[PDB]
Design a protein around this motif. Structure first.
Motif, PDB file in Angstrom:
ATOM      1  N   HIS A  16     -45.955  12.518 -53.590  1.00  0.00           N
ATOM      2  CA  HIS A  16     -46.123  13.859 -53.040  1.00  0.00           C
ATOM      3  C   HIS A  16     -47.093  14.707 -53.860  1.00  0.00           C
ATOM      4  O   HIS A  16     -47.896  15.449 -53.282  1.00  0.00           O
ATOM      5  CB  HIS A  16     -44.757  14.530 -52.900  1.00  0.00           C
ATOM      6  CG  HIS A  16     -43.882  13.887 -51.867  1.00  0.00           C
ATOM      7  ND1 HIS A  16     -43.181  12.723 -52.103  1.00  0.00           N
ATOM      8  CD2 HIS A  16     -43.615  14.232 -50.584  1.00  0.00           C
ATOM      9  CE1 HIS A  16     -42.512  12.385 -51.015  1.00  0.00           C
ATOM     10  NE2 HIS A  16     -42.758  13.286 -50.079  1.00  0.00           N
ATOM     11  N   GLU A  17     -47.043  14.625 -55.195  1.00  0.00           N
ATOM     12  CA  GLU A  17     -48.127  15.195 -55.994  1.00  0.00           C
ATOM     13  C   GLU A  17     -49.467  14.587 -55.599  1.00  0.00           C
ATOM     14  O   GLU A  17     -50.477  15.297 -55.500  1.00  0.00           O
ATOM     15  CB  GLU A  17     -47.901  14.953 -57.491  1.00  0.00           C
ATOM     16  CG  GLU A  17     -46.769  15.655 -58.234  1.00  0.00           C
ATOM     17  CD  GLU A  17     -47.176  17.002 -58.814  1.00  0.00           C
ATOM     18  OE1 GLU A  17     -47.229  17.996 -58.062  1.00  0.00           O
ATOM     19  OE2 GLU A  17     -47.363  17.076 -60.051  1.00  0.00           O
ATOM     20  N   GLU A  19     -50.853  12.904 -52.878  1.00  0.00           N
ATOM     21  CA  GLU A  19     -51.530  13.332 -51.659  1.00  0.00           C
ATOM     22  C   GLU A  19     -52.406  14.543 -51.937  1.00  0.00           C
ATOM     23  O   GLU A  19     -53.635  14.492 -51.825  1.00  0.00           O
ATOM     24  CB  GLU A  19     -50.507  13.695 -50.573  1.00  0.00           C
ATOM     25  CG  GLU A  19     -49.582  12.594 -50.108  1.00  0.00           C
ATOM     26  CD  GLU A  19     -50.245  11.605 -49.167  1.00  0.00           C
ATOM     27  OE1 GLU A  19     -51.324  11.913 -48.629  1.00  0.00           O
ATOM     28  OE2 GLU A  19     -49.661  10.519 -48.960  1.00  0.00           O
ATOM     29  N   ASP A  20     -51.755  15.628 -52.351  1.00  0.00           N
ATOM     30  CA  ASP A  20     -52.412  16.923 -52.456  1.00  0.00           C
ATOM     31  C   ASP A  20     -53.482  16.928 -53.538  1.00  0.00           C
ATOM     32  O   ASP A  20     -54.558  17.506 -53.349  1.00  0.00           O
ATOM     33  CB  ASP A  20     -51.362  18.001 -52.724  1.00  0.00           C
ATOM     34  CG  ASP A  20     -51.904  19.401 -52.549  1.00  0.00           C
ATOM     35  OD1 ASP A  20     -52.061  19.837 -51.390  1.00  0.00           O
ATOM     36  OD2 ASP A  20     -52.174  20.062 -53.573  1.00  0.00           O
ATOM     37  N   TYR A  23     -56.277  14.793 -52.400  1.00  0.00           N
ATOM     38  CA  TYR A  23     -56.934  15.464 -51.282  1.00  0.00           C
ATOM     39  C   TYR A  23     -57.863  16.569 -51.767  1.00  0.00           C
ATOM     40  O   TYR A  23     -58.978  16.722 -51.253  1.00  0.00           O
ATOM     41  CB  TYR A  23     -55.888  16.027 -50.319  1.00  0.00           C
ATOM     42  CG  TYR A  23     -56.460  16.526 -49.011  1.00  0.00           C
ATOM     43  CD1 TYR A  23     -56.666  15.659 -47.947  1.00  0.00           C
ATOM     44  CD2 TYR A  23     -56.791  17.863 -48.840  1.00  0.00           C
ATOM     45  CE1 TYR A  23     -57.188  16.109 -46.750  1.00  0.00           C
ATOM     46  CE2 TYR A  23     -57.314  18.323 -47.645  1.00  0.00           C
ATOM     47  CZ  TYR A  23     -57.511  17.440 -46.604  1.00  0.00           C
ATOM     48  OH  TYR A  23     -58.031  17.890 -45.412  1.00  0.00           O
ATOM     49  N   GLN A  24     -57.420  17.359 -52.750  1.00  0.00           N
ATOM     50  CA  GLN A  24     -58.280  18.406 -53.294  1.00  0.00           C
ATOM     51  C   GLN A  24     -59.512  17.810 -53.963  1.00  0.00           C
ATOM     52  O   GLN A  24     -60.619  18.345 -53.831  1.00  0.00           O
ATOM     53  CB  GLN A  24     -57.497  19.275 -54.280  1.00  0.00           C
ATOM     54  CG  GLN A  24     -56.345  20.062 -53.660  1.00  0.00           C
ATOM     55  CD  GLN A  24     -56.792  21.328 -52.949  1.00  0.00           C
ATOM     56  OE1 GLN A  24     -57.924  21.427 -52.473  1.00  0.00           O
ATOM     57  NE2 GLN A  24     -55.897  22.306 -52.872  1.00  0.00           N
ATOM     58  N   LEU A  27     -61.764  16.523 -51.194  1.00  0.00           N
ATOM     59  CA  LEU A  27     -62.374  17.627 -50.460  1.00  0.00           C
ATOM     60  C   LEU A  27     -63.472  18.297 -51.280  1.00  0.00           C
ATOM     61  O   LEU A  27     -64.504  18.700 -50.732  1.00  0.00           O
ATOM     62  CB  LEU A  27     -61.295  18.632 -50.060  1.00  0.00           C
ATOM     63  CG  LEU A  27     -61.585  19.587 -48.906  1.00  0.00           C
ATOM     64  CD1 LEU A  27     -62.139  18.823 -47.720  1.00  0.00           C
ATOM     65  CD2 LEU A  27     -60.310  20.317 -48.517  1.00  0.00           C
ATOM     66  N   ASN A 312     -65.027  17.309 -38.513  1.00  0.00           N
ATOM     67  CA  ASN A 312     -65.259  17.397 -39.950  1.00  0.00           C
ATOM     68  C   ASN A 312     -66.318  16.435 -40.473  1.00  0.00           C
ATOM     69  O   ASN A 312     -66.852  16.670 -41.563  1.00  0.00           O
ATOM     70  CB  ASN A 312     -63.950  17.156 -40.713  1.00  0.00           C
ATOM     71  CG  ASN A 312     -62.891  18.194 -40.391  1.00  0.00           C
ATOM     72  OD1 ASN A 312     -63.183  19.385 -40.292  1.00  0.00           O
ATOM     73  ND2 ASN A 312     -61.652  17.744 -40.226  1.00  0.00           N
ATOM     74  N   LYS A 335     -53.852  12.733 -46.065  1.00  0.00           N
ATOM     75  CA  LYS A 335     -53.250  13.725 -45.153  1.00  0.00           C
ATOM     76  C   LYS A 335     -53.873  13.573 -43.769  1.00  0.00           C
ATOM     77  O   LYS A 335     -54.127  14.546 -43.151  1.00  0.00           O
ATOM     78  CB  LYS A 335     -53.346  15.164 -45.658  1.00  0.00           C
ATOM     79  CG  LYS A 335     -52.648  15.501 -46.959  1.00  0.00           C
ATOM     80  CD  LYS A 335     -53.193  16.751 -47.551  1.00  0.00           C
ATOM     81  CE  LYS A 335     -52.367  17.297 -48.690  1.00  0.00           C
ATOM     82  NZ  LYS A 335     -51.306  18.209 -48.226  1.00  0.00           N
ATOM     83  N   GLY A 336     -54.089  12.351 -43.329  1.00  0.00           N
ATOM     84  CA  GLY A 336     -54.632  12.109 -42.006  1.00  0.00           C
ATOM     85  C   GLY A 336     -56.061  12.561 -41.809  1.00  0.00           C
ATOM     86  O   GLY A 336     -56.515  12.662 -40.667  1.00  0.00           O
ATOM     87  N   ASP A 337     -56.787  12.830 -42.891  1.00  0.00           N
ATOM     88  CA  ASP A 337     -58.154  13.337 -42.825  1.00  0.00           C
ATOM     89  C   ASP A 337     -59.118  12.169 -42.997  1.00  0.00           C
ATOM     90  O   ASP A 337     -59.278  11.644 -44.105  1.00  0.00           O
ATOM     91  CB  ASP A 337     -58.379  14.405 -43.895  1.00  0.00           C
ATOM     92  CG  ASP A 337     -59.721  15.097 -43.763  1.00  0.00           C
ATOM     93  OD1 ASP A 337     -60.663  14.483 -43.218  1.00  0.00           O
ATOM     94  OD2 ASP A 337     -59.834  16.259 -44.207  1.00  0.00           O
ATOM     95  N   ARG A 339     -63.110  10.841 -42.237  1.00  0.00           N
ATOM     96  CA  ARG A 339     -64.460  11.313 -41.964  1.00  0.00           C
ATOM     97  C   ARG A 339     -65.466  10.219 -42.286  1.00  0.00           C
ATOM     98  O   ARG A 339     -65.189   9.292 -43.051  1.00  0.00           O
ATOM     99  CB  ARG A 339     -64.809  12.570 -42.777  1.00  0.00           C
ATOM    100  CG  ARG A 339     -63.789  13.688 -42.698  1.00  0.00           C
ATOM    101  CD  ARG A 339     -64.210  14.866 -43.550  1.00  0.00           C
ATOM    102  NE  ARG A 339     -63.104  15.791 -43.776  1.00  0.00           N
ATOM    103  CZ  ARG A 339     -63.230  16.970 -44.373  1.00  0.00           C
ATOM    104  NH1 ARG A 339     -64.416  17.374 -44.806  1.00  0.00           N
ATOM    105  NH2 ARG A 339     -62.169  17.748 -44.537  1.00  0.00           N
ATOM    106  N   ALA A 368     -52.431   4.048 -43.048  1.00  0.00           N
ATOM    107  CA  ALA A 368     -52.148   5.415 -43.469  1.00  0.00           C
ATOM    108  C   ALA A 368     -50.656   5.642 -43.670  1.00  0.00           C
ATOM    109  O   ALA A 368     -50.260   6.461 -44.509  1.00  0.00           O
ATOM    110  CB  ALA A 368     -52.705   6.408 -42.448  1.00  0.00           C
ATOM    111  N   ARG A 375     -52.311   2.067 -50.099  1.00  0.00           N
ATOM    112  CA  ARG A 375     -53.312   2.382 -49.080  1.00  0.00           C
ATOM    113  C   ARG A 375     -54.677   1.880 -49.543  1.00  0.00           C
ATOM    114  O   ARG A 375     -55.503   2.624 -50.078  1.00  0.00           O
ATOM    115  CB  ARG A 375     -53.342   3.879 -48.797  1.00  0.00           C
ATOM    116  CG  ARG A 375     -52.125   4.423 -48.075  1.00  0.00           C
ATOM    117  CD  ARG A 375     -52.258   5.926 -47.894  1.00  0.00           C
ATOM    118  NE  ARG A 375     -50.983   6.570 -47.592  1.00  0.00           N
ATOM    119  CZ  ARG A 375     -50.758   7.872 -47.739  1.00  0.00           C
ATOM    120  NH1 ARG A 375     -51.721   8.665 -48.185  1.00  0.00           N
ATOM    121  NH2 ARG A 375     -49.570   8.379 -47.442  1.00  0.00           N
TER     122      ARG A 375
END
Ligand SMILES: *[C@@H]1O[C@H](CO)[C@@H](O)[C@H](O)[C@H]1NC(C)=O
Ligand SMILES: *[C@@H]1O[C@H](CO)[C@@H](O)[C@H](O)[C@H]1NC(C)=O
Ligand SMILES: *[C@@H]1O[C@H](CO)[C@@H](O)[C@H](O)[C@H]1NC(C)=O
Ligand SMILES: *[C@@H]1O[C@H](CO)[C@@H](O)[C@H](O)[C@H]1NC(C)=O
Ligand SMILES: [Zn+2]
Lengths: 596, 195
Positions: A16-17, A19-20, A23-24, A27, A312, A335-337, A339, A368, A375
């Motif tokens: 859980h840490e 993912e975010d 992701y950051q 991104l 995106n 997170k399902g993103d 591209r 996913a 993954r």
């Protein structure tokens, strides 16, 4: 609570840490790669640094939970991947020395420049300067100058650094309880604790060398045909029985023989299938290219692209002043993103690359639902193998006709198909001896079987014997020619290109049998075959949760790497090559060299 | 002709975290349920026991509206007999649930560039929740056998985990606002009819 149950809860928090924080970082990385600004480099580094620090922290905490007290394998796989010390098993001084060495070799490779004689200001970098020469020049001396000056002025810088790199990497690897750094690399294929599916690190050497023996007859006949064609073009430079000079191979290293096609094309009177003009005539754009690729995957039962993919992704060059890295890449941000970054042009090549890149996205979407650490592809060669087979189907005349790009009045004749299989072989077959000899040289250096005072002597002995290529200039031990290639100086393992290549034809043969394709394997198109997509999807969704031996068995029904599908693909060319070489010498002497 | 205050629930500026889900009791008013079910603005409208089709012809003693935010993939868990982080630790519906579950995508409201971390969910708990139970506790979860002393560390985790809601997330990770309507029937005045 048991150790295992503590581990599950620890992995629950880590996922859980992760993912975010991943992701950051992804991104921030995306914003720089699509919009190159100084602020974006800063934010990319800040986000990347926190992710690296978090991984460090989490690896140390993962080492609290003994693997010996865990029975659930899918839990044990996640802890083991997070537990790996990497460079953090060495002392703090030695890891800093290693990181400094790695950065210096990377900087030398990317900033190394060669200036021509008599003008110290007209200097060239490897990209694009020297690469342009090695891929387009027909002049013997211009190619020789680029080949030698790259190795003599940049490679010699890398020689002392690479020696220290060997010592420190072996120190991390033996501290991680591996025989050496090469044995550490081979651990990507290791499988333990799964009855019927285990695979040892030393087994990879045996399987690579066994499958390479069966490749030799096809490569020898490819090599003889190429040598004969080049000998006609350069009669005073090429021996009928000798090795191919290393600077006459189409790129800086002879890694691929792709750019030898113009001088070796069997029937230079029949033009290529270039569907670019039809795309322009029908006013295709980048979105049309990617919708067509999307319909290809939908046709085999795979899902369409997400709404976020269309909103995106960057499918065209941003243009005016917003500037971007145009290398085609498929992004899994989490997170399902999903591209794709690609500066798409309206050409046949970009049309095939779009299918290739979207094949990566289909692999990403399929696993996913797996836990974060699982993954990925089954091993290092799976993900690229999935991408390659998509462009195989999309490029066939059968597929190009069905989408209205190739004229229905175009019928395959055997001469155009020999032309097509040659150019495939120049790229795909030609790199296999190159890829194998290089990784074995590194394996032997790491194992301690090559003394430092024989590094280049043994490197060029194996070039002559295994690859059939000879250096045009004698090189003493001040040279570090292997480090003149990106993957060697940038600390990347290389056998992945050998394994991936065998995997992709195993995949294609299995899927084409599921699609009930008739005729030669190279004409196959898996379009409209839900049976073929289903058998592919049964491996894609596994991600990394299962042994790669089992994941391979899901597609092809076999548990190990097999070379027969690769030979099956190229058999029409192999038969034609053997008939061409009937009044030619097949094989090479290793004693002949251009410098006599 | 006193109208039930549904807009205060559905159109609220900010929803509650699922671990601390709001409940608003609804009493002595007239409810036009058909407006909600025939609005075509929700992605999920599923009723259990009662029928969404024109059963605003019934009287109920009290109506409860439970609201919170979860991600799209967790919307299945708002249903009888479901398991998962939300169903076991945050919001639990009974097996004999009589009511409706309403959800809609709220990416335009609860997402933010850089991440909206306003919404939390309970990630660890010693046991599962009873139906319609709420736990807002912030006690550090003791995964091991060594006491945590009120701070997080090895085998000691803060029990609440935040959603990172970004507008670029996939649909399964995008925020969804959920309203759960409970229709209670007591041996009692039955004050909520709502023609
Ligand atoms: C590019 O980045 C700058 C900041 O580095 C930002 O202000 C600008 O809006 C960005 N442009 C685009 C097109 O994203
Ligand atoms: C391993 O644990 C996961 C979740 O903790 C569980 O779903 C799975 O069944 C377990 N596998 C085995 C073999 O016990
Ligand atoms: C993908 O297909 C589904 C049907 O399975 C459809 O509902 C959705 O709108 C499609 N999305 C796109 C972007 O084509
Ligand atoms: C929320 O606001 C919209 C627009 O003002 C309105 O149509 C809708 O009925 C409101 N919701 C409720 C439950 O009244
Ligand atoms: Zn690729």
């Amino acid at each position: 609570s048991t150790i295992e149950e503590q581990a599950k809860t620890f992995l629950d928090k880590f996922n859980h840490e992760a993912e975010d924080l991943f992701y950051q970082s992804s991104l921030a990385s995306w914003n720089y790669n699509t919009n190159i600004t100084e602020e974006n480099v800063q934010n990319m580094n800040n986000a990347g640094d926190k992710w690296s620090a978090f991984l460090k922290e989490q690896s140390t905490l993962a080492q609290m939970y003994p693997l010996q007290e865990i029975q659930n394998l899918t839990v044990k796989l996640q802890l083991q991947a997070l537990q790996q010390n990497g460079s953090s098993v060495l002392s703090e001084d030695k890891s800093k020395r290693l990181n400094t060495i790695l950065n210096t070799m990377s900087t030398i490779y990317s900033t190394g420049k060669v200036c021509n004689p008599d003008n110290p200001q007209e200097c060239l970098l490897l990209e694009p300067g020297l690469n342009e020469i090695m891929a387009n020049s027909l002049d013997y001396n211009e190619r020789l100058w680029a080949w030698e000056s790259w190795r003599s002025e940049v490679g010699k810088q890398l020689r002392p650094l690479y020696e220290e790199y060997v010592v420190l990497k072996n120190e991390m690897a033996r501290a991680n309880h591996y025989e050496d750094y090469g044995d550490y690399w081979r651990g990507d294929y290791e499988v333990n604790g799964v009855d019927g599916y285990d695979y040892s690190r030393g087994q990879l050497i045996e399987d690579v060398e066994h499958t390479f023996e069966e490749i030799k007859p096809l490569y020898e006949h490819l090599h003889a045909y190429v040598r004969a064609k080049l000998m006609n073009a350069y009669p005073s430079y090429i021996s009928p029985i000798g090795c191919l000079p290393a600077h006459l191979l189409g790129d800086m290293w002879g890694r691929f023989w792709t750019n030898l096609y113009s001088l070796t094309v069997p029937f230079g009177q029949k033009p290529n299938i270039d569907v670019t003009d039809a795309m322009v005539d029908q006013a295709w754009d980048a979105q049309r290219i990617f919708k067509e690729a999307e319909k290809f995957f939908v046709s085999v039962g795979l899902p369409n692209m997400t709404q976020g993919f269309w909103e995106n992704s960057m499918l065209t060059d941003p243009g005016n002043v917003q500037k971007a890295v145009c290398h085609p890449t498929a992004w899994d941000l989490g997170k399902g993103d999903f591209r794709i970054l690609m500066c798409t042009k309206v050409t046949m090549d970009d049309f095939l690359t779009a299918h290739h890149e979207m094949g990566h996205i289909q692999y990403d979407m399929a696993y996913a639902a797996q836990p974060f650490l699982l993954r990925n592809g089954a091993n290092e060669g799976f993900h690229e193998a999935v991408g390659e087979i998509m462009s195989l189907s999309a490029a066939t005349p059968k597929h190009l006709k069905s989408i209205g790009l190739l004229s229905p009045d175009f019928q395959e004749d055997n001469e155009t198909e020999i032309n097509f299989l040659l150019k495939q072989a120049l790229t795909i077959v030609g790199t296999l001896p190159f890829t194998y000899m290089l990784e074995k040289w590194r394996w032997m250096v790491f194992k301690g079987e090559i003394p430092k005072d024989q590094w280049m002597k043994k490197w060029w002995e194996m070039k002559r014997e295994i690859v059939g290529v000879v250096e045009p200039v004698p090189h003493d031990e001040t040279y570090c020619d292997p480090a003149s290639l990106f993957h060697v100086s940038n600390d990347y393992s290389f056998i992945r290109y050998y394994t991936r290549t065998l995997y992709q034809f195993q995949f294609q043969e299995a899927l084409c049998q599921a699609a009930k394709h008739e005729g030669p394997l190279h004409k196959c198109d898996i379009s409209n075959s839900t049976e073929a997509g289903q058998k592919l999807f049964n491996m894609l969704r596994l991600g990394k949760s299962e042994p790669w031996t089992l994941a391979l068995e899901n597609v092809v029904g076999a548990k190990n790497m097999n070379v027969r599908p690769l030979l099956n693909y190229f058999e029409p060319l192999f038969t034609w090559l053997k008939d061409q070489n009937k009044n030619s010498f097949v094989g090479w002497s290793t004693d002949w060299s251009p410098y006599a | 002709t006193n109208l039930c205050p549904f807009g205060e629930v559905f159109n609220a500026t900010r929803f509650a975290s699922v671990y601390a889900w709001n409940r608003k009791r609804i009493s002595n008013c007239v409810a036009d349920y058909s407006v909600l079910y025939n609005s075509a603005s929700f992605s999920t409208f599923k009723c259990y026991g009662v029928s969404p089709t024109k059963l605003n012809d019934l009287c109920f003693t009290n109506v409860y509206a439970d609201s919170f935010v979860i991600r799209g993939d967790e919307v299945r868990q708002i249903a009888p007999g479901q398991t998962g982080k939300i169903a076991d630790y945050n919001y639990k519906l009974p097996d004999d649930f009589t009511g409706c579950v309403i959800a809609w995508n709220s990416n335009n409201l609860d997402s933010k560039v850089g991440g909206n971390y306003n919404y939390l969910f309970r990630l660890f708990r010693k046991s599962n929740l009873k139906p319609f139970e709420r736990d807002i506790s912030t006690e550090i979860y003791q995964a091991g056998s060594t006491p945590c002393n009120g701070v997080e560390g090895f085998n000691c985790y803060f029990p609440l985990q935040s959603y990172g809601f970004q507008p670029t997330n996939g649909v399964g990770y995008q925020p969804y606002r959920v309203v759960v309507l409970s229709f209670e029937l007591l041996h009692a005045p039955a004050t909520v009819c709502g023609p």
